Amino acid sequence: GRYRIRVATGAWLFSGSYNRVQLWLVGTRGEAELELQLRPARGEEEEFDHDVAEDLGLLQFVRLRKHHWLVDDAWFCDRITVQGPGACAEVAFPCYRWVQGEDILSLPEGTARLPGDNALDMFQKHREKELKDRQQIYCWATWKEGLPLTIAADRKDDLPPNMRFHEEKRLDFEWTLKAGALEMALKRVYTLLSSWNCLEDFDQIFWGQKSALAEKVRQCWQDDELFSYQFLNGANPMLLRRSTSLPSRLVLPSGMEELQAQLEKELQNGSLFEADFILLDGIPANVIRGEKQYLAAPLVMLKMEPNGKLQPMVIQIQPPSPSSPTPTLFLPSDPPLAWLLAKSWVRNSDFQLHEIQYHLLNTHLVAEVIAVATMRCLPGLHPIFKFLIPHIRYTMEINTRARTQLISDGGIFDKAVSTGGGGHVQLLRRAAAQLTYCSLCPPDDLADRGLLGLPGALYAHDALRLWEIIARYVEGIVHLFYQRDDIVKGDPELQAWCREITEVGLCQAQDRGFPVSFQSQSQLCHFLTMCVFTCTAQHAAINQGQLDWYAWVPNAPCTMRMPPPTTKEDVTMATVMGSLPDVRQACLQMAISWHLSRRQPDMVPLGHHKEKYFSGPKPKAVLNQFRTDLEKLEKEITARNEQLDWPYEYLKPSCIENSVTI
Amino acid sequence: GRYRIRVATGAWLFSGSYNRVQLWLVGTRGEAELELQLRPARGEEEEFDHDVAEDLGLLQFVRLRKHHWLVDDAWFCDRITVQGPGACAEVAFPCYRWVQGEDILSLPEGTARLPGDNALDMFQKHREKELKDRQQIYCWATWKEGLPLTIAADRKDDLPPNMRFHEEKRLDFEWTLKAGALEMALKRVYTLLSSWNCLEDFDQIFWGQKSALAEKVRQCWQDDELFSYQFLNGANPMLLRRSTSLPSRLVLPSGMEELQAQLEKELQNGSLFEADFILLDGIPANVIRGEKQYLAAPLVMLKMEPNGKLQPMVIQIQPPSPSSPTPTLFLPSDPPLAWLLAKSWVRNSDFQLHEIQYHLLNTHLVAEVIAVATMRCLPGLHPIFKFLIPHIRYTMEINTRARTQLISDGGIFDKAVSTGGGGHVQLLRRAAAQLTYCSLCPPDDLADRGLLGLPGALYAHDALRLWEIIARYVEGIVHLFYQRDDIVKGDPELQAWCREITEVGLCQAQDRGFPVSFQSQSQLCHFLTMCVFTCTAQHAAINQGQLDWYAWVPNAPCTMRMPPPTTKEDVTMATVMGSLPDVRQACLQMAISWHLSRRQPDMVPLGHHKEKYFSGPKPKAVLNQFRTDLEKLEKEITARNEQLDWPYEYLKPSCIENSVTI
Amino acid sequence: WKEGLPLTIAADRKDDLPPNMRFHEEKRLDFEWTLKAGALEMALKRVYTLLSSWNCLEDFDQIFWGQKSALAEK
Numbered sequence A, B: 001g002r003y004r005i006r007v008a009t010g011a012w013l014f015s016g017s018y019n020r021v022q023l024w025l026v027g028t029r030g031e032a033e034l035e036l037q038l039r040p041a042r043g044e045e046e047e048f049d050h051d052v053a054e055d056l057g058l059l060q061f062v063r064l065r066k067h068h069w070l071v072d073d074a075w076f077c078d079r080i081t082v083q084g085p086g087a088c089a090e091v092a093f094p095c096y097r098w099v100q101g102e103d104i105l106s107l108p109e110g111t112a113r114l115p116g117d118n119a120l121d122m123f124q125k126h127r128e129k130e131l132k133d134r135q136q137i138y139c140w141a142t143w144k145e146g147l148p149l150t151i152a153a154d155r156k157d158d159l160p161p162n163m164r165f166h167e168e169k170r171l172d173f174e175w176t177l178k179a180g181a182l183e184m185a186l187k188r189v190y191t192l193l194s195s196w197n198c199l200e201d202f203d204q205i206f207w208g209q210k211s212a213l214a215e216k217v218r219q220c221w222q223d224d225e226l227f228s229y230q231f232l233n234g235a236n237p238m239l240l241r242r243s244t245s246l247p248s249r250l251v252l253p254s255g256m257e258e259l260q261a262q263l264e265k266e267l268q269n270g271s272l273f274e275a276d277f278i279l280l281d282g283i284p285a286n287v288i289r290g291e292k293q294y295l296a297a298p299l300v301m302l303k304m305e306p307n308g309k310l311q312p313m314v315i316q317i318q319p320p321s322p323s324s325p326t327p328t329l330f331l332p333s334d335p336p337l338a339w340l341l342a343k344s345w346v347r348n349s350d351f352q353l354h355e356i357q358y359h360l361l362n363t364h365l366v367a368e369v370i371a372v373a374t375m376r377c378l379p380g381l382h383p384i385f386k387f388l389i390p391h392i393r394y395t396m397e398i399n400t401r402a403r404t405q406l407i408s409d410g411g412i413f414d415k416a417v418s419t420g421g422g423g424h425v426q427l428l429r430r431a432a433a434q435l436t437y438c439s440l441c442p443p444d445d446l447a448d449r450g451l452l453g454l455p456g457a458l459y460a461h462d463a464l465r466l467w468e469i470i471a472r473y474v475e476g477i478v479h480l481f482y483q484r485d486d487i488v489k490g491d492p493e494l495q496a497w498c499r500e501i502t503e504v505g506l507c508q509a510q511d512r513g514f515p516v517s518f519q520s521q522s523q524l525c526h527f528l529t530m531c532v533f534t535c536t537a538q539h540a541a542i543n544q545g546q547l548d549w550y551a552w553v554p555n556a557p558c559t560m561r562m563p564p565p566t567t568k569e570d571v572t573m574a575t576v577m578g579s580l581p582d583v584r585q586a587c588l589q590m591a592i593s594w595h596l597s598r599r600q601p602d603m604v605p606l607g608h609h610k611e612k613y614f615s616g617p618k619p620k621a622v623l624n625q626f627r628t629d630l631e632k633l634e635k636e637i638t639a640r641n642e643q644l645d646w647p648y649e650y651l652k653p654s655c656i657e658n659s660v661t662i
Numbered sequence C: 001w002k003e004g005l006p007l008t009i010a011a012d013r014k015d016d017l018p019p020n021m022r023f024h025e026e027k028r029l030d031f032e033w034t035l036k037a038g039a040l041e042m043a044l045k046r047v048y049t050l051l052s053s054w055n056c057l058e059d060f061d062q063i064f065w066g067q068k069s070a071l072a073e074k
């Protein structure tokens, strides 16, 4: 009758010394009440040997009440494990939550359970009560119309406590914000007594917030090879697509018959690629400190040479208009300053579409919709919730901090970036209309963009490998808990979660290929693979490259302070320098790039969450197989990268964070 | 053949993601090599299920090698527990150390073991090797001649890494130093545009660094009752002693026949007490910023009324000299300003003797001698080492920080305190000559001082209760591991530790009653009870009252800026105010009082160390009985204190830190 | 000064007042100096509370000094 109760504590803030807890061991045949004296230690759980006279049977719940606690005392309980009298099996009760208030917190038994039709079942009652509690604390908010809905939190303090940053993450985030502000102030003081008239003057600020790859970028940004390489394996690999036909906007003037012949030859050869930034057309540009920024919607046509390297054929900086039916077509054979300015405009547009569409919307906002819907509709007992909860860690707070500080009206995005000041919200709406289910799934996105089988598309290879590994993990968990298709259909909480993402969170995403329901195990598996890839791998691909490719500001301008060139002979070094961002906007670009792309000291690698929501050995085995496949993929990526002058490192699983946290 | 290895990690700093460890399970019949991937979590240990083909037998050692680690990566391993194939007993291997370098770290089996005469025994070889390693990293240093020896560390960075502050303690200590510096700067700015001519002007600085008891002290410091009460239950309860005879220095002039009759009546009644500050006689006073400080060696005679309250009879501020054969005898019936100045001089002298003799020397330096000798002569296998190691935590670094920052030449003690500037080192030498073994043991110290059985001596009652409880803990551990007297005598490491404290650390303390050897279990029990009380309870008594009694600077001046009065009629408010410290020294007194007496957020209550050095159930039971007695004593002290206008709270076991850390 | 209120002396500023109604030297100097002293003490209190939490009633002890009385302490 000796029950050993081990309380793993994730975090605590105990002002006093007597922090007591009333704990109930609720079993099938009875419950037992205990009084425990919490004295948590770092790295060690607390044991509590207690003799229970009554026969509790199989334990189903652990109930917690904080007994006469101070108001400032906080307790994040990781989990409670109970060893029976002679059972010797540590029955797990995962909590992973802040125990607040004087109310009883019920922790169900750690075996993941689907909802049933037995209303009298204790787990069914607990999951219904839990779902009501979650649907009252986790509410949807419309941040902007036409956008996917957010968590109902005006500020980070309005968030639910379980979605908050833990101490180490919050301290690191705020300290690195102060460090970036300090370094930017030092850079701006440094450039007060220096001229800003040549590209080498960007060396005056190119320090502290940079990488070795960023130094290589500073050495090689003017090369057309690196400019073309950025479309495949740069910060934004999400836009370039193979051309099945010449674009309609690509209007060639007279005398471009050689370029037309080359474009037709690349088209019939199947080596013609395009990056169309047409989503930026008609987007109002920012006005920063009374200075008008400028935006363009370029089209750049690339050719794939036999050596696996892309080469630029033509840049059209502006789409055709009634005012300008035939835009100037910039070529690599042009005067070098005009071609360099055209490449800088294309990379600036890539910066806009990368940060707004493919970083903020496709990864951050989609993961926040997944996070809110997972908390609202999937109870703690649900296997899909236990599967998804490590991959939605810190997503709500990082999106709330973005909405309050970065992308607010007057935020940091309105201080450096050309799409800011309201145009970025319209661009977010336009990209939300383009935010399809097909675009978020690498096999379908890369088949649609024609990037399958490309030897130099390192992102594409790594993303397909990550998708099949993550899909193996997903199908292992789902086939563990959903044996048949009718079991998937018969799960009301899962269907409610699917509707919450599609109908509610993504704002009627039926037309955009998102499912309203799951009719089979495979459909649920594909959707959850999309969720995990968006929360972990897509964000790592679209986020880790910010410092590598954006610390050198001329390689990817955050804004343009001059109108796009319409003639090639009129472009000088003064035109390029006035078109490039000033030192304040460039330093802000560098600081945000560093802050967002740096490795978090408390980061969790993909699949290596320490929180044990699942209790059974079979989901643990599926997770272990997932980790083994990730280490094998990391070995393959390292072996490939060591033989490359330009390694792709953003999709290494150790460097892929387990959720969207930054 | 499935060995489950659980690695509890106290702390880590992992820059990268692949921190591998080669672990050897060394048993009586063989050893097994493993490769473990460390991914530590807060509050949770790391499990590692591994199949061992060979029969290891009973496990004796766990060997650790860091396998290709980064230079900045650090790992403080708490302990390693191994569960056998079907044994089900978690064989513990406590480490509680920073794993540094590429060398193999051998962790013995957690059962405490005495040294044997079998040289071929693996534990004997390990403990000899460990003792050599410890005697090379833990060396004695002579900070000042005539003083007890210190750890060989010129700065805190020169300390052994296992004696360093952990992250939370170091951050809290440095942040509270910056906070105290900020608050003092604000107080000094505040007093620039205010007059300093009355006692109420000390209200201008009496904020932020104070307590409710300190406010009561500000309300009642001029009362003779509180002044007398401070000798029994104030910050310094270590000096007042019952008078068996009238002191020789108490020279009464003519006309003091009534005072002589009262002193004789109190002497024959047995209610005559004295606080003789004669140790301060001839001590050179500080010179702070060109202003000469002044020191006195007073004698104050107290009478115990039937209601249990002490009352002051006479204050002699200066001892008799050839120049002044009959010093002025200040009485409570004098002009009030002269009597108030005499009481302020007595309390200033109490501040000097409290901080130098009874805080720095009797508690901090003695615990540092115990700490260094324990590390040098007692191996990790030794039961007395496992007993003492929680009670020597942070002692070396707090003494090193004191020696480098506070009490150095030009340190903070030379900036506010009258004994500073070199005189405090001479006072430390004089108190070291008075530092007897009898003085550090409450039953003997209170019997010698005649404070036994006093109803109002709350410190004395709490100290005797703490001594008997701690002695029960000590005798439980010792009788668990030392069954006979010849076992105590036959332990060479214990005798070496005794010599290291007495002959080496305390600099030939034979004449001062410290033992050169242990001839019985009871002698070792009494000495270890002295060690634990000095490290925990004596320091708590002499340290927690600093803010309560010293935030109001006129209640206990850190320095005196005028010579002591020789006449009663010439003392004015100007004389008192010029005698009291200026705002800079008073603010420094307040800041140090707050910094030293505040509850550390990471503090370990007495007997509640989470580190499990002992593996057996019987030392755990002895520790549990110790904790139970401490909670019963805390309930008794709280029940006594709730009915008292002046509660004594410094010896509550929850408020007693487990070691000298501040 | 305001409609519906009792009427005031016709003086937009203190300098527009009749000279016989003006503060004498000691009163004016004391009033202005105590305004500067209160501004100084408030600046010091606000600097003090920058690095302190404001979540309990005892945090009002962080500012309860300098401008108080014994009755205010009670």
Ligand SMILES: COc1cccc(CNc2ccc(S(=O)(=O)Nc3nc4ccccc4s3)cc2)c1O
Pocket: A176, A177, A178, A179, A180, A181, A182, A412, A415, A584, A588, A591, A592, A595
């Ligand atoms: C991790 O590093 C960071 C990245 C992004 C933003 C910050 C900090 N917030 C910020 C906002 C606006 C600007 S800003 O130049 O647009 N305005 C300024 N106003 C003032 C006001 C007074 C004195 C100087 C200045 S600079 C700069 C930084 C970082 O620390």
Ligand SMILES: COc1cccc(CNc2ccc(S(=O)(=O)Nc3nc4ccccc4s3)cc2)c1O
Pocket: B176, B177, B178, B179, B180, B181, B182, B412, B415, B584, B588, B591, B592, B595
């Ligand atoms: C927990 O709080 C504390 C307790 C004790 C000491 C410190 C800080 N060290 C310190 C040393 C000397 C002095 S001191 O007034 O003797 N000198 C000064 N020099 C300068 C130099 C420049 C500007 C101002 C000053 S005040 C004060 C503090 C604390 O933060």
Ligand SMILES: COc1cccc(CNc2ccc(S(=O)(=O)Nc3nc4ccccc4s3)cc2)c1O
Pocket: C034, C035, C036, C037, C038, C039, C040
């Ligand atoms: C006898 O003592 C006083 C009582 C009442 C008012 C004053 C002084 N006038 C005042 C007005 C407004 C504020 S206020 O915090 O509302 N604004 C601030 N603006 C700035 C501007 C720059 C720098 C700091 C500040 S604080 C505070 C005082 C006293 O000295």
Ligand SMILES: CCCCC/C=C\C/C=C\C/C=C\C/C=C\CCCC(=O)O
Pocket: A355, A356, A359, A360, A364, A398, A399, A401, A402, A403, A405, A406, A412, A413, A417, A546, A550, A558, A588, A589, A592, A593, A594, A595, A596, A662
């Ligand atoms: C890195 C290039 C410059 C800005 C890019 C624009 C938008 C970022 C994309 C998604 C937004 C998500 C999270 C931002 C994180 C935290 C807000 C704090 C302020 C900051 O982080 O500043």
Ligand SMILES: CCCCC/C=C\C/C=C\C/C=C\C/C=C\CCCC(=O)O
Pocket: B355, B356, B359, B360, B364, B398, B399, B401, B402, B405, B406, B412, B413, B417, B546, B550, B558, B588, B589, B592, B593, B594, B595, B596, B662
């Ligand atoms: C509290 C009254 C004024 C000073 C008293 C004198 C000496 C203290 C007694 C023992 C010394 C031990 C530890 C001091 C701790 C740390 C040094 C940091 C500086 C400081 O802590 O300042």
Ligand SMILES: [Fe+2]
Pocket: A359, A364, A539, A543, A596, A661, A662
């Ligand atoms: Fe991000």
Ligand SMILES: [Fe+2]
Pocket: B359, B364, B539, B543, B596, B661, B662
């Ligand atoms: Fe101390």
